[PDB]
């Protein structure tokens, strides 16, 4: 009952300790040189030293570039950010493309921060409050509150301000609350579960009693990205007046975040890093079909890469010697301007072979939970080598459906032939398109 | 509580209120005697129409 | 290491490598060679530091990977802080909210700053224990104590009317100005720390200030002209200094700010520090932008403009003809050009050694020689990246130093541009053509 | 003291009967253009015509912008003068036509001058004057209020209409701190005082000194406003907590195409006010340089705009020959200006310079930059200007001075200018380097 | 009364200058010559004044500096006030917040006026007495006044809002006051004593006031609650069609019953040659509406390329619009007509001219354009004034002619000094040697 989509049969680069790529491991077959290069790149990323390195993978369609990048992402791990994008995704309408490119650039590097907090959590009783002896018309010196918890109870004294906060929460006496002494904020967890059946009905969920000591010391660790801090500072959510909330009511549209805000954020993050509170972790920004980028974004990439906290960018392209879009007389390899390809490194991806295609089809069948015959698999491999590798992988599923219809669990030669006759490929469609009157 | 206070105290503003009040001040105290007729803000126009 | 940089593309450069007589040393402060360009950049730095010249156009021209951006970064580092240096690229000008001229004007205004001084008087150390008991809250007196002073102040009707709002607990250090303004809450004394067990969200424990109660201080702020324009444009414009949606400030605000700055400078309360506006890849920019710059360079409030380009006789955007450096002759006339030359083998070797030293990579002699050979045949940046790739290769092999085998493995693992171009040419059918014709089928 | 390509230009260097001196006001040569611009300045100061257009044409670096700046200087800071590059009219927020009309209206100015009578000073005493009630009644009746005012060298008591009492009541006037009243309109404005400033221990109330001179005062106040300010103030709202104010504050009010009705209302009220002698109209100058960047639509709208009855005088600068007008591909026109608009304006020619004029220009620019150069290097600089360009020689001055100061010298010599030639290039040598190099240079 | 104005290009013309039977005099009301065009303009003016025919488009075509704009200005001046006349250029339609059709619709609707008459009562006189009683800490006040005329004299007692209405503008016993019962609006006509004669006649009177407003304004008001502000800020976007559909019917019922009366106007479009084909098609469809004013378009192009297409058409307009239009043509000017035009233009600017100077100006306006000499008149007068003699002679005219260049001379100078200026390919030569 697990869903699959052109992937999930790859789960790594299949490299041993020495960096040597095994022929068939981690879902990959062949492509030894590319796998080794990608492993070296992911090792450099784990080194956490460089900034702004650029890798571009070159090869024909259906050769493994996207699979290689996803394998790199899988090898890196969930903690390190990995931001994927398509070339056409940068052309936004709300804001200029350079701003979107910078936002996605900053979304790649991350920051792990930690903070230690104390907290107090069944309310037993509370007493509010001396003589004014001055300009105090109504004086509330202190408020005494007792909490029960589970591992023993305790009473304490607290400021009038937190008492007014409690009144804003408007909690009862037989309740469980959540008070964080760091910010002096009380949160009403709810009623007490043991205080049920006082009335036959009650809308509020009763909620059980908090476990453990009432006075809890704890520490918390959160992973964010610099873009999160930039967004938080650019569009603060705090505010009680009409203007702030009505600004919160309007749709949030991207603006041109200034450079000064980014500099101040960097300074604060550096100050916190120097104290050991938080540590940064660069990530990866992945771009598909970079030939969809125009000359302006390509030029701005030169300035962005030579920055100080730029992440590692991985680019994919399958074009040959083509005109860079945005200009009419610039023939360049892979549709990338000469300066940019001078700024990066190139990794070549080689086309597959018949045996590799057969093994890929077998692996896809196994990961799809299907049964095939050796003769049927051979016919499928020959078909793929005749039309395309992707055609056989796409055609595998309707063969399974047809087999299931006739109460047969194994893919056989006649099912494959029937699928071939039922579903066409690009070559046959092209060959039957021009040989007709109506299009 | 020492670490809490040492974290809470340094919350300085990037652009202080004093700086912006100094920048937005008006050096001219009083002028424009006959300007309640040339200006005529449209909030008054709504009532006049 | 005040900045958050991990390792930049050119972080080994800290200022221009020149001396008192402006003669550039062969190698110092991370710069190697380019003696003529370094001398010209030092002259430019002296001119901008002088501050008596406004609106000069200098253009750095040279083939790619010859140090133009490196030269500008060195100039910015040698100029030091406290002097604005606005670095932008051409493609950032085209915006969806502002016109090209508006963005250019905003950059020009950001490029030059002003130092404004302000004299103020305060009263601090309001550990009071107030004494207020006629009628209507009479007996308006309160004490003020500090380390070296202690005195009792009587109060007026308006003073107590201000005091009742924002109540002072008579044991909290508070500040107040004699400018007939507002009394400002500062903090609480340390004596009242143990009293409660959970402090609020606005209470802090500051020590008792020392010295004298009535203090007088001057404070100097460094503000750009653009910041002043943004602040005065709207009701709350300072927020637009972060969001960025200023929205084409009108000319009346700009001329009013110009008059205000002139008055401040005349009265001695402010002084103008000019800066430098650096533009990478100035070749890609509309004819409208050059047309606007041609006139914006002549203003009195104009910084020193540095431009970088690496194009030959190319077409200028927004037109049909071809011009040198991708710039119109009208703009090229009012500028002075500093040309950077190609690099020598020995200079390439020295640059490679410096970059490797920056990354704590120990190269063998033969490895460095092979890297220099590759950087001579191919581009320099290729070898500059190859050093780090080979360092990773060697680290995977459990060996600190990098050898010829590691460098050759890195060379055969990552492809140079020329080899990739040759492979593409030899296999045109497999790649997607300019007409979208491809041959996916292998047979 | 900062100089930027200008500030050595102080007027046209003209003379009575409108003859331009050869060297005056930082100007050398260009006698005919200076005389024509002086005639234009006289026409401006006449303040009778409307929408007169002149276009001054010539080659680059021939003083085209300097002439317009000189006429702006001669006109004086009182008259409005709006500079504009042709590429500024293309605005993202609003259409180019409305921006052109806004800049067109910004050049027209209005001077408001009026007198006010003021009794300002420190209150000595204030007292109502009981008197017999005009009608049948049983109670006190106040017929006057006596207020005494003392200022530096002056003192005077005044009897005033008692109905003004509320003005004191609303103003919280107190006694002896301050006062400042208008004469005819009534009402009072409370401007404490230094006499009691040190009397109190501390107080959050400001203090002002004793007003100088006689309590009675005649004051003449004059200010200037452009019509664009009146339009934008009439259109834009103001106030406090009203819903419209909140909407404006929450919306980032980008520019809007102001309707014609508001402009007509402003024109009518301004005409009514200048009919009363309290206001005066001052037509200004709208200077647009590099008009070749204007689109054909802007030219067509300018054709109609110049025929309005409240148009300012528009001067245009261009340095193009037979060129295709922007926005079209089959119209080729002189100076990149369509012939229909060319037929509506007056051309002013501008000639290039001679070597002696270039030498004088360089000498004057060196003097204004606080530099000393002898003839042995001035001749070389003049030859450089005649060979490369005038602007190149003008720019090369400062690097030469810096190089001289580096060598602990004071005078610019031939060696310094030669070294500056070696360090910084002109356009021609840069192009020669570009053509002879085949390394993407 | 006269609004703000200066000496404009067409300030010397006031009306078409016709006879009682539409016969144009050779020179009258500032218009000289062009009898056929003037008579056609008079016929169109009669068409507009009759107010029965709707949606007629008439095109004025001729070479530059011929008199089409002057003809339109004369038509507008002769039509007088109270009749809308919306003059726009061809490039004003393009906008970043309104579609071309929306802007064209607004321009069409801006030139039809609606007039509503209403009857207002007034009480006017000189204040004789006023007693006013304020209760401190009380919420109600007691007022009374005594007001007289030369014949009547009567007292009134006032309610609540009357007192505050009288107190915001200080009303004293020496004032003359007029009060509208319906609105309660204060109006101060002057202080009799303590320069206006005492009001006479009955203490109360009745009068009629007319509120006139454009149909576009009524359309804008009902679009949105805030749309009223758009009457001044000009920020209204794409009013929905149903609003116009309902407002047209409402105006129709108002006219049919008799509350209001409508007045059609004229929409003048200058430089109509530049306009997208979409605008031309929209005009083709919208000319047929019953609520459409007379459209007068001006053009000076020959067989030119229509914008938004790739084919050339006469006048730059498509044949579809030309089919449903009426064309008036203008012809060039005789030398005597040019001399008369120069004479009247010089008379407008209160400039005294000498006969030989006038003849030289006529000659130079014959060789060059007429606008050249018309412009030269004022600078010649300025030179003459600077020479301290208040009379323009031939010498001043020649000085102005040599000082200020002509298009032909500038073109010849550019053609012979090509290397000096920037050519079309961007190559210039600034170095002398
Ligand atoms: N070496 C390989 N081992 C296993 N599967 C592969 C290999 N190379 C390519 N594939 C499969 O081919 C499919 C399509 O290839 P893809 O990476 O999308 O081509 P492209 O690089 O043009 O995007 C992927 O789903 C991937 O699983
Ligand atoms: N004189 C120099 N000293 C140190 N590094 C240099 C020098 N010249 C070039 N480089 C190196 O070259 C790179 C800059 O290349 P650059 O010429 O700025 O490229 P572009 O011309 O495309 O801007 C930097 O990474 C820098 O390390
Ligand atoms: N007669 C003159 N007197 C003084 N300076 C002059 C004169 N003619 C030209 N200049 C110099 O030439 C420069 C003006 O160039 P300009 O001709 O306005 O360029 P463009 O025509 O492209 O606008 C100014 O810096 C000015 O110092
Ligand atoms: N019949 C006329 N009477 C008076 N002035 C005229 C006449 N014909 C043309 N003119 C003048 O010629 C100038 C050109 O105007 P006109 O020809 O109407 O516009 P266009 O040049 O667009 O055709 C105007 O300033 C006008 O005063
Ligand atoms: Mg892919
Ligand atoms: Mg660069
Ligand atoms: Mg200029
Ligand atoms: Mg016309």
Curated annotation (Swiss-Prot), chain A:
Reaction catalysis annotation: ATP + H2O = ADP + phosphate + H(+)
Pfam families named in the record: TIP49 (PF06068), TIP49_C (PF17856)
Matching InterPro entries: AAA+_ATPase (IPR003593), P-loop_NTPase (IPR027417), RuvB-like (IPR027238), RuvB-like_C (IPR041048), RuvBL1/2_DNA/RNA_bd_dom (IPR042487), TIP49_P-loop (IPR010339)
Subcellular location: Nucleus
GO molecular-function terms, A-Z: 5'-3' DNA helicase activity; ATP binding; ATP hydrolysis activity; DNA helicase activity
Any one annotated GO CC term: Swr1 complex
Cited SUPFAM superfamilies: P-loop containing nucleoside triphosphate hydrolases
One GO term (biological process): regulation of transcription by RNA polymerase II
Residues that coordinate or bind ATP: 59-66
Enzyme Commission code: 3.6.4.12
Cystine pairs: none
Keyword field: Acetylation, Activator, ATP-binding, Chromatin regulator, DNA damage, DNA repair, Helicase, Hydrolase, Nucleotide-binding, Nucleus, Transcription, Transcription regulation
Other notes: Present with 11600 molecules/cell in log phase SD medium.
Subunit structure: Probably forms a homohexamer. Interacts with RVB2 and may form heterododecamers with RVB2. Component of the SWR1 chromatin remodeling complex composed of at least ACT1, ARP4, RVB1, RVB2, ARP6, YAF9, VPS71, VPS72, SWC3, SWC4, SWC5, SWC7 and SWR1, and perhaps BDF1. Component of the chromatin-remodeling INO80 complex, at least composed of ARP4, ARP5, ARP8, RVB1, RVB2, TAF14, NHP10, IES1, IES3, IES4, IES6, ACT1, IES2, IES5 and INO80. Component of the R2TP complex composed of at least RVB1, RVB2, TAH1 and PIH1. Interacts with SPT15/TBP and HSP90.
Family recorded in the similarity comment: Belongs to the RuvB family.
Record-given protein name: RuvB-like protein 1
Gene: RVB1
UniProtKB/Swiss-Prot annotation, chain B:
Residues spanning the signal sequence: none
Subcellular localization(s) per the UniProt record: Nucleus
Chain ranges passing through the membrane: none
Extra information: Present with 656 molecules/cell in log phase SD medium.
Role played: Catalytic component of the SWR1 complex which mediates the ATP-dependent exchange of histone H2A for the H2A variant HZT1 leading to transcriptional regulation of selected genes by chromatin remodeling.
Quaternary data: Component of the SWR1 chromatin-remodeling complex composed of at least ACT1, ARP4, RVB1, RVB2, ARP6, YAF9, VPS71, VPS72, SWC3, SWC4, SWC5, SWC7 and SWR1, and perhaps BDF1.
Family to which this protein belongs: Belongs to the SNF2/RAD54 helicase family. SWR1 subfamily.
Record's protein name: Helicase SWR1
Species of the source: Saccharomyces cerevisiae (strain ATCC 204508 / S288c)
Full-protein positions shown: 1125 to 1173 of 1514
UniProtKB/Swiss-Prot annotation, chain C:
Molecular function terms, GO-annotated: 3'-5' DNA helicase activity; 5'-3' DNA helicase activity; ATP binding; ATP hydrolysis activity; DNA helicase activity
Pfam family of the protein (one): TIP49
Effect of residue 68 to R: Growth defect at 37 degrees Celsius
Assigned GO CC terms: chromatin; Ino80 complex; NuA4 histone acetyltransferase complex; nucleus; R2TP complex; Swr1 complex; TTT Hsp90 cochaperone complex
Binding site for ATP: 62-69
Signal peptide per UniProt: none
Reactions catalysed according to its record: ATP + H2O = ADP + phosphate + H(+)
Keyword line: Activator, ATP-binding, Chromatin regulator, DNA damage, DNA repair, Helicase, Hydrolase, Nucleotide-binding, Nucleus, rRNA processing, Transcription, Transcription regulation
GO BP terms, alphabetized: box C/D snoRNP assembly; chromatin remodeling; DNA repair; protein stabilization; regulation of DNA-templated transcription; regulation of transcription by RNA polymerase II; rRNA processing
Catalytic activity, EC: 3.6.4.12
Record family assignment: Belongs to the RuvB family.
Name this protein carries in UniProt: RuvB-like protein 2
Gene: RVB2
């Amino acid at each position: 009952v697990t869903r699959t989509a052109a992937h999930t049969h790859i789960k790594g680069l299949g490299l041993d300790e020495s960096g040597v790529a095994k022929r068939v491991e981690g879902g990959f077959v062949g492509q030894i040189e590319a796998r080794e290069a990608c492993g070296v790149i992911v090792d450099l990323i784990k080194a956490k030293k460089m900034s702004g390195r650029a890798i571009l993978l070159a090869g024909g369609p259906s050769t493994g570039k996207t699979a290689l990048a996803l394998a790199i992402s899988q090898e890196l791990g969930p903690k390190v950010p990995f931001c994927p994008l398509v070339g056409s995704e940068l052309y936004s309408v709300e804001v200029k493309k350079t701003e979107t490119l910078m936002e996605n650039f900053r979304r790649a590097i991350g920051l792990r921060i930690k903070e230690t907090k104390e907290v107090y959590e069944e309310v037993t009783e509370l007493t509010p409050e001396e003589n004014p002896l001055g300009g105090y018309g109504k004086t509330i010196s202190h408020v005494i509150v007792g909490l029960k918890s589970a591992k023993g109870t305790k009473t304490l004294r607290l400021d009038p301000t937190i008492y007014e906060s409690i009144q804003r929460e408007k909690v009862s006496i037989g309740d469980v609350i959540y008070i964080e002494a760091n910010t002096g904020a009380v949160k009403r967890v709810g009623r007490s579960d043991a205080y049920a059946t006082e009335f036959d009905l009650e809308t509020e969920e009763y909620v059980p009693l908090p476990k453990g000591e009432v006075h809890k010391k704890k520490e918390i660790v959160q992973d964010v990205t610099l873009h999160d801090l930039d967004v938080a500072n650019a569009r603060p959510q705090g505010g009680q007046d009409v203007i702030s909330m009505m600004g919160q009511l309007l749709k949030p549209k991207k603006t041109e975040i200034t450079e000064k805000l980014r500099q101040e954020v960097n300074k604060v993050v550096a100050k916190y890093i120097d104290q050991g509170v938080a540590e940064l972790i660069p990530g990866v920004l992945f771009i598909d079909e970079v030939n969809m980028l125009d000359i302006e974004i390509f030029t701005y990439l030169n300035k962005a890469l030579e920055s100080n906290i730029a992440p590692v960018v991985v680019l994919a392209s399958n074009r040959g010697m083509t005109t860079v879009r945005g200009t009419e007389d610039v023939i360049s390899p892979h549709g990338v301007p000469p300066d940019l390809i001078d700024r990066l490194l190139i990794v070549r991806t080689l086309p597959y072979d018949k045996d590799e295609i057969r093994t890929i089809i077998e692996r896809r069948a196994t990961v799809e939970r299907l049964q095939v015959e050796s003769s049927a698999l051979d016919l499928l491999a020959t078909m793929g080598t005749e039309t395309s590798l992707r055609y056989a992988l796409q055609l595998l599923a309707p063969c399974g459906i047809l087999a299931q219809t006739s109460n047969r669990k194994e893919i056989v030669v006649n099912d494959v032939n029937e699928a071939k006759l039922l579903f066409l490929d690009a070559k046959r469609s092209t060959k039957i398109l021009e040989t007709s009157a109506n299009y | 509580v020492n670490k809490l206070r040492c974290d809470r105290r340094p919350i300085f503003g990037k652009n202080l209120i004093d700086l912006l009040t100094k920048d937005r001040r008006v050096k001219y105290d009083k002028s424009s005697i006959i300007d309640n007729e040339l200006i005529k803000p449209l909030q008054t126009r709504v009532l006049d129409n | 290491l005040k900045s958050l940089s991990l390792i930049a593309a050119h972080s080994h450069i800290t200022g221009l490598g020149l001396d008192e007589n402006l003669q550039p040393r062969p190698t110092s402060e991370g710069m190697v060679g380019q003696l003529q360009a370094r001398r010209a950049a030092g002259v430019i730095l002296k001119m901008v530091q002088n501050g008596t010249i406004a609106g000069r156009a200098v253009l750095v021209a040279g083939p790619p990977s010859t140090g133009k951006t490196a030269l500008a970064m060195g100039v910015s580092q040698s100029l030091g802080k406290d002097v604005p240096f606005t670095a932008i690229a051409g493609s950032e000008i085209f915006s969806l909210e502002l016109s090209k001229t508006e963005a250019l004007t905003q950059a020009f205004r950001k490029s030059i700053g002003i130092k404004i001084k302000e004299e103020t008087e305060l009263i601090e150390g309001e550990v009071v224990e107030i004494q207020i008991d006629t009628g209507g809250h009479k007996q308006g007196k309160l004490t003020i104590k500090t380390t070296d002073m202690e005195t009792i102040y009587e109060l007026g009707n308006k003073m107590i009317d201000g005091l009742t709002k924002e109540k002072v607990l008579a044991g909290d250090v508070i500040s107040i100005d004699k400018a007939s303004g507002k009394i400002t809450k500062l903090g609480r004394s340390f004596a009242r720390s143990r009293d409660y067990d959970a402090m609020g969200a606005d209470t802090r424990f500051v020590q008792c200030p020392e010295g004298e109660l009535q203090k007088r201080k001057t404070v100097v702020h460094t503000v750009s002209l653009h910041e002043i324009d943004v602040i005065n444009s709207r009701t709350q414009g300072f927020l637009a200094l972060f969001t960025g949606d200023t929205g084409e400030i009108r000319s009346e605000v700009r001329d009013q700010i110009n008059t205000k700055v002139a008055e401040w400078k005349e009265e001695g309360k402010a002084e103008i520090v000019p800066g430098v506006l650096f533009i990478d890849e100035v070749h890609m920019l509309d004819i409208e932008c050059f047309s606007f710059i041609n006139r914006a360079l002549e203003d009195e409030f104009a910084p020193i403009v540095m431009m970088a380009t690496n194009r030959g006789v190319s077409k200028t955007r927004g037109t049909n003809y071809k011009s040198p450096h991708g710039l119109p002759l009208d703009l090229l006339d009012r500028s002075i050009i500093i040309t950077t030359k190609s690099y020598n083998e020995q200079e390439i070797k020295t640059i490679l050694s410096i970059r490797a030293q920056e990354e704590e990579v120990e190269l063998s002699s033969d490895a460095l020689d092979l890297l220099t050979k590759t950087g001579v045949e191919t581009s320099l940046r290729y070898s500059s990246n190859l050093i780090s790739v080979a360092q990773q290769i060697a680290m995977k092999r459990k060996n600190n130093t990098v050898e010829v085998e590691d460098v050759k493995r890195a060379y055969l693992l990552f492809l140079d541009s020329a080899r990739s171009v040759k492979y593409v040419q030899e296999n045109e059918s497999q790649y997607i053509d300019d007409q979208g014709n491809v041959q996916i089928s292998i047979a």
